Amino acid sequence: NLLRHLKISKEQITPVVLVVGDPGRVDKIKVVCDSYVDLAYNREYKSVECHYKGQKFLCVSHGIGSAGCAICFEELCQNGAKVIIRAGSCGSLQPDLIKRGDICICNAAVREDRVSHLLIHGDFPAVGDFDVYDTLNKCAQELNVPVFNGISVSSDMFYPNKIIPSRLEDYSKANAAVVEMELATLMVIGTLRKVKTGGILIVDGCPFLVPHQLENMIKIALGACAKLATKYA
Amino acid sequence: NLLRHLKISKEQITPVVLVVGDPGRVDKIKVVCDSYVDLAYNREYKSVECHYKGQKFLCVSHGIGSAGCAICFEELCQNGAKVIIRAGSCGSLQPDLIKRGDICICNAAVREDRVSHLLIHGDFPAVGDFDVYDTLNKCAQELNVPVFNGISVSSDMFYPNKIIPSRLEDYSKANAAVVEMELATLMVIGTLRKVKTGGILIVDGCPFKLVPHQLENMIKIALGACAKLATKYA
Amino acid sequence: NLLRHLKISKEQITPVVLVVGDPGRVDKIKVVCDSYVDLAYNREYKSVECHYKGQKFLCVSHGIGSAGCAICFEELCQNGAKVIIRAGSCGSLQPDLIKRGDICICNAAVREDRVSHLLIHGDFPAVGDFDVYDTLNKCAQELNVPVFNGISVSSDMFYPNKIIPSRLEDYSKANAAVVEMELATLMVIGTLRKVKTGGILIVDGCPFLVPHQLENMIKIALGACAKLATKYA
Amino acid sequence: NLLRHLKISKEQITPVVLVVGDPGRVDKIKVVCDSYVDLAYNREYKSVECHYKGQKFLCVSHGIGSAGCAICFEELCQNGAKVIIRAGSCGSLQPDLIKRGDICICNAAVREDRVSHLLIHGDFPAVGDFDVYDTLNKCAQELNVPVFNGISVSSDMFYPNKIIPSRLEDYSKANAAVVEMELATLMVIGTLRKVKTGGILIVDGCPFKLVPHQLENMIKIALGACAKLATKYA
Amino acid sequence: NLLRHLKISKEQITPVVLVVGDPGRVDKIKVVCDSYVDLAYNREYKSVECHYKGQKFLCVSHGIGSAGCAICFEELCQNGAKVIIRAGSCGSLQPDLIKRGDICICNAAVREDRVSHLLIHGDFPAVGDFDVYDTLNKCAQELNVPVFNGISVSSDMFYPNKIIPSRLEDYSKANAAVVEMELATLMVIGTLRKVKTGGILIVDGCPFLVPHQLENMIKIALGACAKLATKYA
Amino acid sequence: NLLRHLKISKEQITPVVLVVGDPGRVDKIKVVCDSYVDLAYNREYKSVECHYKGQKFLCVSHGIGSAGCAICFEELCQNGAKVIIRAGSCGSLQPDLIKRGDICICNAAVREDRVSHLLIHGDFPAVGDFDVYDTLNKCAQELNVPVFNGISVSSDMFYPNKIIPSRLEDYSKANAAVVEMELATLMVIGTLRKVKTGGILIVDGCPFKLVPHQLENMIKIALGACAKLATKYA
Ligand SMILES: O=c1[nH]cnc2c([C@@H]3N[C@H](CO)[C@@H](O)[C@H]3O)c[nH]c12
Ligand SMILES: O=c1[nH]cnc2c([C@@H]3N[C@H](CO)[C@@H](O)[C@H]3O)c[nH]c12
Ligand SMILES: O=c1[nH]cnc2c([C@@H]3N[C@H](CO)[C@@H](O)[C@H]3O)c[nH]c12
Ligand SMILES: O=c1[nH]cnc2c([C@@H]3N[C@H](CO)[C@@H](O)[C@H]3O)c[nH]c12
Ligand SMILES: O=c1[nH]cnc2c([C@@H]3N[C@H](CO)[C@@H](O)[C@H]3O)c[nH]c12
Ligand SMILES: O=c1[nH]cnc2c([C@@H]3N[C@H](CO)[C@@H](O)[C@H]3O)c[nH]c12
């Protein structure tokens, strides 16, 4: 009995899920786990079950964009997911400090989408679970990988025009660290459906992927998923 | 030197483009053509040059959702596309009149997204080009396929909640025909970058509570229109 | 039994109606038809029945402004009108291309009013019926009159101040052709009440009437009304 | 050299102006005066110089609706008017207390228009000048005409629909007295251009569900106030 | 039986109430009346009953800020207050004309708060009662004290940042006289609960207290309260 | 040279500040410390330097409400504060789970104010610093005090009306724990001025329909956290 977009079953959904933008990235992640079980591939949603450090968790892709990743997150949350960690890339809003290849672990986001607003009034915060943020940070410490922490702007516009000015400059003076396209949506949906969420991002651009740094980030994401998967096993 | 997301080059972009959501649909479309050439497949964006009735145009996937599809449309418009037609599925907002399997060709859309709003004020209409619309309707007549016309609601929310009421009921009473997730964004981006746009949709569901020959028909109409439109660019 | 503002009866309303801003313009239009029947004149609303090319249709005035023309359109739509075509003047938002005296046939509009927003959420498009737009364009071809096509900004402000900046510059970079004060309102009301609407405008100003060009525009409007009136006779 | 819409010249504008919606009302008002002079009639704008109690002031029509009347008010304010009083009709939002034929003199209005918002932020109040208000009320006392005071809702929507609920019910509970279509716009334009404004209204209807002597009385009060106010401009 | 924040009883509330920002100011006001009766002091809300010119009225403090003064005004209005006059300080938005120490009597305000908007749609005017404004002005005439009249901007921001621009410049070109932080809130709450309100302010700053001028302002406020208290005695 | 409202000087501001609403609460807190020094009392702002566990930090009152408390937070942040913890009371929005007397330590807030919006766009989150949050939670563990975590609604409206429905019901369904009037403003101001913030609240009421030892416990936790945090500033 299958989920409309993900095309996996309720009983295939693990408590912990690592989510990812590029479907290609699922393939490159499962290959560094102890083993894996391919589950489904429909549209941009590729589902693979990972086995790492004695634990098991899904890794699922959602494509680019809040509306498309919302479908993913809703299907996960309405069907037994308890923890969802986003691993992806972003641009830097503090180019003096946060540089290409740097890793950012985020605790909150700017809701520059539409879905979240159709779900709850705009005054509501897009904010992550602390345990998840704490686990991610602690893993980065163990693995001896320096990270930044901060707020991400989650904006549905990648390409600005010359008519309405972009708000990236504002949000950067407001001390937002980075910009991507999915994190706020995950956070709001998670809060609404009692799922614990978090975000780890690698800087790939300076709108204002370094091979070994990407490998570190993935180690952190996977470690954190395994650490949190323990509490549910 | 390649487009950041689509991973094709400016020269590979034909004047007319057919756009679809599901990357799987690109492969089902290309075999209905006379011949084709695979160009690229990056993330949710699969690119293929189609050859139909002596004409040559791309077919490109954009995934689900306004933000993800805006990246596709922008890369296309900034690099030479002149006509972009969306072909996809949708839900009925008129379940007494418009039923699972029916085809709707839309002239305008409700902007229930965000990208379009980060680009111009919300008071600005999401409209399609009337030639594209007219071409689509005329193909539907030549191929003897009955077809609805109307307005689509393009909403970023597929799965509603119990706190903020959905606006579908509202837009239904306002005579919006049909609901999906991409058309408004296409239209506004097309208008701002001087690209003619249009959309054709097959009803796959009824959110109030795919037919193979009808899907085949819709693809036929879409491909027919693309060819007719490619004709006027030598 | 009379309509509250128009002061005509249900049975006096024809399927096709040409609407116009200046009440004076009704008088100048009826005089170039084959014959006419004056119906009423209340406030700014002058109603005259026209007979042209074997067809009959109302021609009605509504004054300047969205709130006042809404009353007109609502009384028409709630009482049997099936097609309403707006004929009027506008300013140009592309002064290099669209010049004083030029004719523009419009398919959609910017909803810079209030009525439409009190009727339906702002995300809803103000857009015309294609058959109407097609008929208008085809008439312009027959009569050998070159026209432009495009989006009109319908704005309730004619006179800007120096505090809030006008959006005309924005909407012009957005590729809007022209600016007037009624078209979006007609379009939204029409869509809401299953009436087919359209707009033909003559450029009279460059905010950013050429005697023979006005005569052409009126020929087009009247031809189009007669062509569409046929389908209902 | 004439005003674009009103078709009168700057010199023809008197310090005090009486404004009305119906162009037909201008003609009914001028004959109640001592004498008058027709000035112009263009579109919905009819202009007449009135002479009442040794005083001289214009009476001008503006049609229905905020956008159409804003053009009138702006042309007047930009060219020398100092006081503008609106006299017109309205509906009751307090049908137990305020009944068909009653007269209301309003100090402030709800801005349910658009023009005012394209001119300043919505947080800005639509208020009248208190002298004008006071003069109107004092005339009502001298002429022994009972009168209500309160806030008017100025709404661009006369004919509501079944999709977006009207806000009249709301504003009624908020103690707004009365409803019409022009006052808010007058007030805001007056405030921005340093012109003193006021309004007096006769109730012609009850949108929840014209009395000749009451209308005569209201016009008397309006003309009385205009004369008293024209007095202080030599 | 006591009010939740003010900690006074229904029967202690007089028909007329003078309200004030600084709790310290209550102490300095009661001392220039004929006599007084201290009632309560809870949080920032100090309540004292004043006896002046044969009349009696409360004088109550509410602190700085719309949210905090709303609590005060609601407790007063829901418990028998009929007239509430605000006496306080403000900055000047017309620095050429309205100078430090000048007195302004206000009839309306810009609703740059949140409470009023949670109570009623933003299109609703924040406007005072005329009798109150008239009384205040007439007292200023008797006492031979020159005053200004105008609209006050009531804004919840005292300290602007460099990201979103302040609207004070706009509201000043719009001909607003002064800026403070409570008046619009009083006016809206008053209108909603059939209480007559008014405002008298002394200019203390030029964001864009003169000892004898403050004394004048207080004389005016007190006179006006006594004059209005008569109608209810 | 003194701060305009707080009436203390830049040098008197310690890196860590404890903030409370009720000026009366400052006096009840200082006596629970090892020693203290009164600094100032102006309007609703009472300032006192506290000494607890060898550490030194201010305690300052800010009255009720976002606008009044923003003045306090801004004066503190502009003049050297590094950590600001809010300790106060609140209502339950989860009355089956969170009961009168329970303590909630909040990580984030709903921005139902205005100040925060005049400072940055509403899409920006009101979040606390996670160290502050973590410190507070750890103190609660050391002192063996059970404690809730969650999101607070910070609303400028204490007394709702019958015209515009309150949004508490909504935010409750959205899993907001608790409701008060200051936290969102603190958080946003902290984020914009690079100051770490947090909040701890005791439930005093149930707006759907103070326990002394629980209040004592909450103050203990707050003071404990302040000391632990002051430690890292020599
Ligand atoms: O500089 C950027 N701006 C906006 N999005 C992204 C991204 C992420 N990558 C995808 C689009 O490039 C999308 O998933 C977004 O979240 C990386 N860098 C940037
Ligand atoms: O009933 C519907 N609601 C919203 N979207 C869709 C669609 C289309 N399919 C995809 C998601 O189901 C998306 O691209 C959307 O445009 C088909 N039916 C519906
Ligand atoms: O340049 C213009 N700006 C705004 N409206 C108009 C108009 C039209 N004429 C009337 C006001 O001048 C009104 O009906 C509007 O629709 C002509 N030119 C312009
Ligand atoms: O009940 C009413 N609702 C809205 N407007 C009006 C009016 C006035 N009459 C005109 C339209 O009926 C218009 O100028 C408006 O201001 C009288 N009664 C009502
Ligand atoms: O220049 C000013 N701007 C904003 N508020 C005030 C005030 C008033 N004083 C208090 C804050 O300084 C507050 O009650 C506000 O209403 C005096 N001057 C100004
Ligand atoms: O149930 C409540 N709603 C709103 N505020 C509060 C408070 C706090 N107490 C003060 C007002 O009662 C204010 O500072 C607010 O933050 C306790 N309980 C509630």
E strand residue ranges, chain C: 16-20, 35-42, 45-52, 55-61, 83-92, 103-112, 126-127, 148-155, 178-180, 196-205
Cα-to-centroid distance, E114 and ligand 6 (Å) = 16
With beta carbons less than 8 A apart as the criterion, state whether C179 and C91 touch: yes
> Which residue precedes each gap in chain F (C to N above 2.5 Å)?
209
Q: Which domain range does residue F162 map to?
A: 1-234
Nearest chain D alpha carbon to F162: D173
Alpha-carbon gap: F109 to the closest alpha carbon of chain D (Å): 25
Task: Let me know the angle formed at the C-alpha of C28 by C22 and C33, rounded to the nearest 5 degrees.
Answer: 130
Mutate to test the pocket of ligand 6, among F20, F25, F44, F89 (most ligand atoms within 8 A of CB): F89
The CATH number of the domain holding residue F137 is: 3.40.50.1580
Per the CB < 8 A criterion, the answer to whether C214 and C146 are in contact is no
Please report residues of D whose CB lies closer than 8 A to that of C63: 43-44, 63-65, 68
**DSSP string computed for D91-134:** EES-TTTS-TT-EEEEEEEEEESSHHHHHS-TTS-EE--HHHHH
How far is it, in rounded angstroms, from Cα B173 to Cα C190? 13
Q: How far apart are CA F142 and CA F162, in angstroms?
A: 46
F118 in contact with D at a CB cutoff of 8 Å?
no
CA angle F159–F161–F162, rounded 5-degree value:
155
Q: How many residues does chain F have?
A: 234
Neighboring chain B residues of D164 at a CB cutoff of 8 Å? 170
B31 Cβ contact partners less than 8 Å away, ≥ 6 residues apart: none
Q: How far apart are CA B135 and CA B152, in angstroms?
A: 19
Closest CA in chain C for residue A165: C170
HSE toward the beta carbon, residue B114, CA cutoff 13 A = 26
Tell me if D102 sits within 8 A of C82, measured CB to CB: no
Helices C66-77 and D66-77, packing angle to 10 deg: 160
Number of helical H runs and strand E runs in chain F: 7, 10
Say if residues B166 and B157 touch (Cβ distance below 8 Å).
yes
Q: Do residues E52 and E13 lie in contact, with contact meaning Cβ atoms separated by under 8 Å?
A: no
> For residue C155, what are the contacts with CB-CB under 8 A and spacing of at least 6?
C110, C112, C113, C167, C168, C179, C181, D118
* D5 Cβ contact list (under 8 Å, min separation 6): C64, D42, D43, D45, D71, D72, D75
For chain D, the first-to-last Cα distance in angstroms comes to: 25
CB of E205 closer than 6 angstroms to any ligand 5 atom = yes
Nearest CA-CA partner of A8 in A39, A38, A46, A30: A39
Question: Looking at CA atoms only, how far is residue F166 from chain B in angstroms?
Answer: 13
Note whether E80 contacts F: Cβ–Cβ < 8 A.
no
**After what residues is chain B interrupted, C–N > 2.5 A?**
209
All partners of chain D with 3 or more CB pairs under 8 angstroms: B, C, E, F
What gap in Å lies between CA F153 and CA E114, rounded to an integer? Answer: 14
Rounded CA-CA distance B181/B116 in Å is 12
E170 interfacial to chain D (CB closer than 8 Å) = yes
Instruction: State yes or no: chains F and A have 3 or more CB pairs below 8 A.
Output: yes
Spacing, Cα E21 to ligand 5 middle (Å): 9
Number of helical (H) and strand (E) elements in chain B, helices listed first: 7, 10
Take residue D2 and report the two structure tokens written for it. 């004439």
Q: Is the CB of C115 under 6 A from ligand 3?
A: no
Give CA F147 to chain center in angstroms.
16
Q: Residues 182..211 of D with a Cβ closer than 8 Å to E: which? A: 184, 191-192, 194
Of A24, A67, A161, the CB nearest to B67: A67
Q: What type of residue sits at position E121?
A: H
Question: Rounded CA gap, E68 and F155, in Å?
Answer: 11
Exposed/middle/buried for F115, CB within 10 Å: 0-12, 13-18, 19+?
buried
Check the annotation: does D181 bind a ligand.
yes
Inter-chain touch C170–A164, beta carbons under 8 Å? yes
Query: Which helix (H) or strand (E) segment is B68 a member of?
Result: helix B66-77
Cα–Cα distance measured from residue E198 to residue E195, given in angstroms and rounded to the nearest whole number:
10
Tell me, in angstroms, the distance from the centre of ligand 5 to residue E20's CA: 12
- Specify whether the CB–CB gap between E221 and E6 falls below 8 A: no
Q: Which of A180, A183, A201, A206 to mutate to test the pocket of ligand 1 (most atoms within 8 A of CB)?
A: A180
Query: What is the C-alpha to C-alpha distance for residues C6 and C74, in angstroms, rounded to an integer?
Result: 10
**DSSP 8-state symbol, D11:** G
**All residues at 6 or more sequence positions from A85 whose CB lies less than 8 Å from its CB, including other chains:** A16, A17, A18, A19, A132, A136, A197, A198, A199, A200, A221, A224, A225, A228
Q: Which of F22, F23, F66 is the closest to E156 by Cβ?
A: F66
Type of residue numbered D124: F
Residues 6+ apart with CB under 8 A from A76: A6, A13, A17, A19, A58, A60, A84, A195
CB B215 within 8 A of CB B103: no
Cβ–Cβ < 8 Å for C147, C177: no
| CA atoms of C65 and C182, how far apart (whole Å) | 6
How many angstroms separate the Cα of A46 from the Cα of each of A20, B165, E204?
9, 31, 65
| E128 contacts E151 by C-beta, under 8 angstroms | no
**How many angstroms away from the CA of F62 is the closest CA of chain A?**
23
Please, what sign has the CA dihedral across residues E69, E72, E77, E80?
negative
Dihedral of the alpha carbons of A153, A156, A159, A165, in degrees to the nearest 10: -70
Q: Is A157 on the interface with E (CB under 8 A)?
A: no
List of residues 6+ apart from B210 with CB closer than 8 A: B89, B101, B202, B204
Closest among F98, F93, F116, F92 to F183, alpha carbons compared? F116
- Non-local (6+) Cβ contacts of B144 within 8 A are none
> Which member of F74, F113, F120 has the closest CB to residue E163?
F120
| DSSP single-letter state for residue E194 | T
Instruction: Report yes or no: D165 at the F interface, CB cutoff 8 Å.
Output: no
Total count of domains within chain F: 1
The DSSP element (H or E) to which C215 belongs, if any, is helix C211-230
Q: Distance from E111 to chain A by nearest Cα, in Å?
A: 19
Ligand 5 centroid vs E9 CA: distance in angstroms? Answer: 30
Please list the residues that pair with C36 across neighbouring strands: C50
State the resolution, in angstroms: 2.8
Structure token pair of residue C136: 């208008």
Spatial distance between the Cα atoms of A165 and B119, rounded to a whole number of angstroms? 8
Please report where in the chains the tokens 């052709």 appear, as a residue. C177
Cα of B100 vs centre of ligand 2, distance in Å, is: 13
